[PDB]
Write a protein that binds this DNA or RNA. Structure first.
Ligand SMILES: [Zn+2]
Length: 118
RNA sequence: CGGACACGGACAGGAUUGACAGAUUGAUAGCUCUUUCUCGAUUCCGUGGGUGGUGGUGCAUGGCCGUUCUUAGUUGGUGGAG
């Protein structure tokens, strides 16, 4: 009840991510890839094939979420506002985490990993 | 572009930077073009609004300066005259 809800919220304050329409499928090619995330609403079955094309033979893990729009307020483009429109982003399908920096509640995302995926 | 901001759009399933090579230039200006790699919300676009100007107007002015003006000249108060 803690992995899907809140311990991926706290890995998002000022950490490394992908941003915009030119680097979502970019970060996979580097040897700094910690926990990444992919949306299970992707219109083509080739992009989701392409993110598992690297990580399934390597040390990198994706978590399948609903869509990328609900990840749009997770990347950093905050559009939910008091005098602002709560609908401005069409969010990202693949962001990574380069470095955590803080270790308050960062265990519970990797606790999900080696519990079934070993 | 060194067009700030403000709003809408464009906008992670494809906004924007940079650049080797060649006909391409006056020019090793990616200026543009053919082709392709690269940059990470930075911008780009429309609409308002700034802003810059050795642009106008010295007869819209300030300041400074020249001059009549290198000569002795000028002004109140209170009384006097009208
Ligand atoms: Zn003029």
């Amino acid at each position: 009840n803690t992995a899907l809800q809140e311990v991926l919220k706290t890995a998002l304050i000022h950490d490394g991510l992908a941003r915009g329409i030119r680097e979502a499928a970019k970060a996979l090619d580097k040897r700094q890839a910690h926990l990444c995330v992919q949306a299970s609403n992707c219109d083509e079955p080739m992009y989701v094939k392409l993110v598992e094309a690297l990580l399934a033979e390597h040390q990198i893990n994706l978590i399948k979420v609903d869509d990328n729009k609900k990840l749009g307020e997770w990347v950093g483009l905050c559009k939910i506002d008091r005098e602002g429109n709560p609908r401005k982003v069409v969010g990202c399908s693949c962001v990574v985490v380069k470095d955590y920096g803080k270790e308050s509640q960062a265990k519970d995302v990797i606790e999900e990993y080696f519990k079934c995926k070993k």
